[PDB]
Every structure is written in C-alpha cells, then in structure tokens.
Amino acid sequence: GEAPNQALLRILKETEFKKIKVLGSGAFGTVYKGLWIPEGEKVKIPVAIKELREATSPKANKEILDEAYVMASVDNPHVCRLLGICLTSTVQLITQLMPFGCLLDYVREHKDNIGSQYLLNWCVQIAKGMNYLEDRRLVHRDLAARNVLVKTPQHVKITDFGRAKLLGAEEKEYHAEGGKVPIKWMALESILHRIYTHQSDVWSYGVTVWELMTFGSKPYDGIPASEISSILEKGERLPQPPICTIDVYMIMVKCWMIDADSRPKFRELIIEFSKMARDPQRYLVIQGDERMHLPDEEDMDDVVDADEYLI
C-alpha cells in the first residue's frame, strides 16, 4: 500500500539547450556542460547533459531510464534533481550543473584548503540527503564520496542513482542478483547475502565520511576485495583518520556495527554532526584550520540555478 508517484517527467527539446563544453567522455556517451533555455521563459540554466553513445544497447537504455525514473521522483536540497530528458536518436539525461564536480576529487585537490567546518557541514548535508531517501523508502545502494557532487564548496548533493532500489511498504529488505558492486563501501550483510537496507546505506555513509576525513584516501587499499568479507568478520575496521577526535571516529565505527539495527539512523547522524558542526575545532584537529578559505560565459545576466527554477 503505497502512495501514487505523481512526480513529473519533463520532456525537453534538443533546441532548448546548447552544449558549451565537454565534462567527460565515456563508453556510454559524452557528458556535456551546457545551458538549458526553456522556450520563452527568458532564463538560462546551467545543466549537465549526458548524450548516450550512438551505438546504444536496449539494455543500456532500459537501465538509464530507471535512473531518470528515480532522479525525477526526488525533491530535496541535498539530492541531485533531474531537470528532464531529451528523446533524440540517443537519449539525453539532463541534470543541474555541479560545477566543482565530484566531492571525492574536490577533497583530493583542496585538502590543504579544507577546514573542519566544511567537512562537518558536508557530513550533515549527506546525512540530510540520505535521511530524505529513507522517508521516500529509497535505498541508494551505492553511496561513496565519488557519488556526491559539489554545487558550491558549501553545498553538496547525493547522486548516481543507477543502483537505487525502492521498498514496498511491506518490504523491509532488498535482495539482488549479481552485478558489479562497490565491495569496499558495502555492509557485510550486503557482501554475504546481497542484502540492502537503509542501514546498509549507513555503513556506506560511515565509509564515505572516512573518505572525507582522510582527504580522499582509498578504503582498505592494499587489500583485495575478495578478502574484505573475512576481515570484517574478524572485526577489523578502517583506521581512525589523523584529524579525527574519538567522538567523530566513534560515530563512524557505529555505522560499521554488524547488528545493522545497532547502527545509527540518518536522523541521528544529522543530529550528531550538526552538534559537532557548531564547534568544529573541538571535533576535528587540522593544521591551519582557523585560516583556510574556500570559494564561464558573459551571457550570465539571465542565468538562474536549477535550485531556483521551479515548475
């Protein structure tokens, strides 16, 4: 017994947007940075555009539309909203432009300039996003610093919904069949039994914050993924990041409990990081913290952020 999903899938015309430049090139297709100018609205909207490869399998399209299905059914400040799709010879997915790209890349490039206030703020925002996903009974199933985008250094959003699943109101657990999977982010219960929960997302949340507090270090690097299940069973966990007070690290550890019900709830994480965010230098010890500072076309006059463009 679930509510009808009355979200609107918007169909865009190829004429309504112009692609300025190429963010990335993929086997699947090319991702473009461009502007979306809805017809006769006198606004221009920074967008990221996927244009799928000319040779597109019927599986790859059926899979991509699921991602669009999800990204369209979400409305939250800390989740990437999807503006619409374009049904050209190759389908185009259209999302809000996240100029600073991947959060993982961002921490790697800026570690010297990143301060406790930002880190903790990020932890909170991701927790809010994930909490919203729980309200929508959604399980992301692939949360990692690679899948959080940076709109501004002070505003990050969760992304990459390709693996996301929906739970029947009765349904409590998700059972899956073999596919490529992010072993080093996964709950143990997921690796052993292909089981996913809102709580298995918390585990991945744990790993995600750990990525941020190590400035982009690779979890369980040097050890092969085939070994991970046996190692968690032993009780071994990721080490405490150098900048991390026990308070923060405690919290990560809790995400990695084995009794999944013993792990914290995203709403609780929101609360804990939010307390900590108030007094950042008490909870993260970073050299030079007190002094760190963090932050085209001329057609900019009419530009509006997707976040301010509401339908």
Partner: peptide, 9 residues
C-alpha cells in the same frame, strides 16, 4: 572509479 566495482558472481 572502475577498480572500485567488483563483479559479484
């Protein structure tokens, strides 16, 4: 990154 995703079967 591709090296993070391992074929589960």
């Amino acid at each position: 990154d591709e090296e993070d995703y391992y074929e589960i079967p």
